[PDB]
RNA sequence: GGUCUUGUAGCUCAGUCGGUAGAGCAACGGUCUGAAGAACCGUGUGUCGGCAGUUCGAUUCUGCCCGAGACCACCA
RNA sequence: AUCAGGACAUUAUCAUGUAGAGAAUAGGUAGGAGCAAUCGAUGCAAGUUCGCUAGGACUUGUUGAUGCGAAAGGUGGAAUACUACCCUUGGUUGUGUGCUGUUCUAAUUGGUAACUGUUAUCCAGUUUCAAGACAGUGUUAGGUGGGCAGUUUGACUGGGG
RNA sequence: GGACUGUUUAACUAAAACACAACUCUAUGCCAAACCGUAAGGUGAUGUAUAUGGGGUGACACCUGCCCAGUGCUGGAAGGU
RNA sequence: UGGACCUAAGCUGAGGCUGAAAAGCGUAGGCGAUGGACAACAGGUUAAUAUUCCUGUACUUACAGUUAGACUGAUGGAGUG
RNA sequence: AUGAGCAGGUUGAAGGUUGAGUAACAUCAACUGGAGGACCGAACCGACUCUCGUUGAAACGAUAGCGGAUGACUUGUGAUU
RNA sequence: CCUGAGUAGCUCGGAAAACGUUAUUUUGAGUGAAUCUGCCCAGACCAUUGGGUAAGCCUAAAUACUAAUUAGUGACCGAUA
């Protein structure tokens, strides 16, 4: 559900397809709650010390991050209700505020399959298989899509949390754990079935058809114009300089940090997600 | 290294009265039976004194292990819980059993990690074994409320 | 400091020769391993000890 | 080339690789097309990788060399 | 810690062997004019192994104290059997040299989560969970590597190199 | 020729370059690679793979042909090493 | 309007975490104001002057008395700025 | 992070509103409307260019044009590499 | 009976001694002995020979100098010094 942008201008046009952006992140005039509002750390793409971390970052249009509770173990077995869909410009997904009926408001991710007012139940128990029901992978039946994946028991969901993200289940392993999960980016992982996850898919499935259109929209969301490494200077990339078109330097063009970048995998040797794979991008781990 | 072997367990057969095998930093450096002690108390003159000490502690240690087995069969512990909407609410950590053990004026151990979170409740048995000839068994009763 | 703290076995501060053989200095660092020492009333937290220091303390029976 | 493999008909691979060099391809005798293309069935030919050793009839067998591939241009 | 596995040289073990001619499968060298007979033959019915398809060899009942031609007629370039050596070729209990498959928590860890201090982001301890001897760690050494440096790329020449 | 509204040699060339949009390629599970810091600690990003890091082309549209011989890359693998 | 109030990017920093030293990250508190919040206007006034000095007029701030009713109810939290 | 200016002339897509109409949509018709890296341009800033200047009034300006100004316009203090 | 334990030495890299690492002195990592009834040293090493007792510690002096006090001196200058 997207719509193209009509320039209607007297100086050039743009080619953009944009979501409605007023049903998700819908506030016409926003009056955010002041007792629940926070101010974030702003370096413009730099380290806390200020040193560069990525090339030419900046352009965030004053984002404010709503607090989110991904563990969802603090209100287990209590029947909440979807109270509101709160604004969240810092992400691609706009999380949902719910309220457990003992008088406890909280936040959860926004999966497709919850409506404002639905009495939901986030508990670590064999409960109804619906979105907004954060529930361990052990009791989740095979062949069902899932998100909010995590790989540390009693830690809270971290993996598969962006807007529209999901996963697939096609079996388990003979370890009392490591349920087979086809996780996005084409990785057949085996994460512990005791891990807590939300069955379904995160909201904003329309985010797969967004088109920028302008440099204004390029710089309104934390991104800045990027330059090909061909048109660099000496001592930056060996690509720049000379007459005609700028060459590509060595047999493997480099990064602005000065290292080769073609076909090389930089996987860590201390992450608990490399050994727990069935099929990797080229190998199995 | 460790020169005190009043009792004995090394994941295989080994005997007290000082009979160990090299492990470096391991069960030999961590079990309560095997703890470091200066070598100033070990010599040819001190060999007999060390043997007498090891014996005395062996007999009194077996006696006290039996006696603790019976007294834990006699003296029990107390627990309670709260419930919310027909299902359990959390998980069990050994932090709180350390709390209840200390509250009476003594302490327990840490390096015996063998347990996972107990999703169930009610009366059951926690079996932690500290010695080799007499087993230590504890009963924990949790009252649903 | 990247060195053992209880009993200070400083890294060997010398000069380094190699296929290089240039006028420089180097520190042959110590084998920092998170071991434990014998201390009363608990407080046996993991602390960095050098392995030469580790074997010397093992010879001196202090864990 | 020194830590290793190592070679066959004009070419590709078996070798009583010591005693022997054969199967397919340029080619052949014929064949059917007017004739010729197109054509199916057999081969003509034969560096046994060369030098020092072994010997019953030995470059092949061993050892040395021509080589592709890989550590070995007296010094930061 | 435990755990077994198999490897390389592997003890002892079992089978591995055809140009033809030549009783003939021709493993070779080799003592020998020797040794098979209840140490069950000349062999067989079978089982087993090997098999090149000559059929060979071990085993149980059987052949019966007779000969074995594979002592020896005969052999070729290579001759037997018994007998000894080298084997062949691999296993194998087998020791050593490098190693692989195990688990275990107990070394090792944690911007995994929580309690308390700390209503304190840095934290201390308590822990949770996750595993787990792996990696990492000091030293050593192999490789990686103009991302980077100190520097260098001779001279002659009707100018340069 | 470039997408245009646009930016640069802050003071010749400020453009047909670059940029933007768009097209495509590259690796990665929360210290995500990537990066910074000086280890700490921290960014990317306090992002969660529908996200981040980089490369090549460059309104829109059709394509992007053949080729690994080779460099880099990718994975596998006995053995020499 | 500032400071006597606090808060921005960010920072000093009791403790604490690393690191030849040096030094870095962060914490209480304290900063960081171009922000929030705080209450006054007209007339006339010096060689330089004014809600500021004087005249006619107000808000804001607690105590001593003072009379007075009301049971006050926080530092935590609810709404606000 | 705190901020601030953009006149005037503008455009008028979409969104929304209404009847005719057609088996029904279709189709026609009409108003709000206000989106735009929308337009010229005063304020604004910039600096693509002609001449002066190139022992200037200017350590980059003077003449004359020009770009943008409803947003990739202009923009201060503080603060961050 | 005692006379000072990761210290000789070995392996990989190492620091002064003429020495730019050979005796002597030195160790980041794997290591390694005894206390005279002892071990070490003695420009490979060994036996002899000799030297010494070790794997604890302090110590003024001769070692730099004349800013505080005092006095004097000059092949030092004389305001461009």
PDB file of N, CA and C in Angstrom, chain A residues 74-76 78-80 99-105, chain B residues 84 89:
ATOM      1  N   UNK A  74       8.221  -9.433  32.672  1.00  0.00           N
ATOM      2  CA  UNK A  74       7.863  -8.729  33.895  1.00  0.00           C
ATOM      3  C   UNK A  74       6.359  -8.672  34.125  1.00  0.00           C
ATOM      4  N   UNK A  75       5.554  -9.072  33.139  1.00  0.00           N
ATOM      5  CA  UNK A  75       4.103  -9.035  33.269  1.00  0.00           C
ATOM      6  C   UNK A  75       3.473 -10.326  32.758  1.00  0.00           C
ATOM      7  N   UNK A  76       4.117 -11.463  33.013  1.00  0.00           N
ATOM      8  CA  UNK A  76       3.640 -12.735  32.487  1.00  0.00           C
ATOM      9  C   UNK A  76       2.306 -13.122  33.116  1.00  0.00           C
ATOM     10  N   UNK A  78      -0.512 -12.093  32.959  1.00  0.00           N
ATOM     11  CA  UNK A  78      -1.486 -11.025  33.136  1.00  0.00           C
ATOM     12  C   UNK A  78      -2.038 -10.631  31.773  1.00  0.00           C
ATOM     13  N   UNK A  79      -3.361 -10.529  31.679  1.00  0.00           N
ATOM     14  CA  UNK A  79      -4.020 -10.199  30.421  1.00  0.00           C
ATOM     15  C   UNK A  79      -4.011  -8.688  30.227  1.00  0.00           C
ATOM     16  N   UNK A  80      -3.223  -8.222  29.264  1.00  0.00           N
ATOM     17  CA  UNK A  80      -3.141  -6.802  28.954  1.00  0.00           C
ATOM     18  C   UNK A  80      -4.160  -6.456  27.873  1.00  0.00           C
ATOM     19  N   UNK A  99      -1.449  -2.191  28.334  1.00  0.00           N
ATOM     20  CA  UNK A  99      -1.665  -1.978  29.763  1.00  0.00           C
ATOM     21  C   UNK A  99      -2.220  -3.255  30.379  1.00  0.00           C
ATOM     22  N   UNK A 100      -1.398  -3.934  31.175  1.00  0.00           N
ATOM     23  CA  UNK A 100      -1.867  -5.079  31.940  1.00  0.00           C
ATOM     24  C   UNK A 100      -2.823  -4.621  33.037  1.00  0.00           C
ATOM     25  N   UNK A 101      -3.887  -5.408  33.234  1.00  0.00           N
ATOM     26  CA  UNK A 101      -5.079  -4.992  33.965  1.00  0.00           C
ATOM     27  C   UNK A 101      -4.905  -5.049  35.476  1.00  0.00           C
ATOM     28  N   UNK A 102      -3.672  -5.153  35.963  1.00  0.00           N
ATOM     29  CA  UNK A 102      -3.367  -4.856  37.353  1.00  0.00           C
ATOM     30  C   UNK A 102      -2.955  -3.404  37.532  1.00  0.00           C
ATOM     31  N   UNK A 103      -2.992  -2.613  36.462  1.00  0.00           N
ATOM     32  CA  UNK A 103      -2.609  -1.219  36.507  1.00  0.00           C
ATOM     33  C   UNK A 103      -1.169  -1.005  36.094  1.00  0.00           C
ATOM     34  N   UNK A 104      -0.698  -1.757  35.096  1.00  0.00           N
ATOM     35  CA  UNK A 104       0.713  -1.711  34.702  1.00  0.00           C
ATOM     36  C   UNK A 104       0.819  -1.469  33.199  1.00  0.00           C
ATOM     37  N   UNK A 105       1.068  -0.222  32.810  1.00  0.00           N
ATOM     38  CA  UNK A 105       1.322   0.069  31.409  1.00  0.00           C
ATOM     39  C   UNK A 105       2.747  -0.335  31.034  1.00  0.00           C
TER      40      UNK A 105
ATOM     41  N   UNK B  84      -0.545 -15.453  40.288  1.00  0.00           N
ATOM     42  CA  UNK B  84      -1.238 -14.446  39.490  1.00  0.00           C
ATOM     43  C   UNK B  84      -1.778 -15.112  38.232  1.00  0.00           C
ATOM     44  N   UNK B  89       4.864 -17.233  37.789  1.00  0.00           N
ATOM     45  CA  UNK B  89       5.242 -15.879  37.409  1.00  0.00           C
ATOM     46  C   UNK B  89       6.724 -15.683  37.122  1.00  0.00           C
TER      47      UNK B  89
END
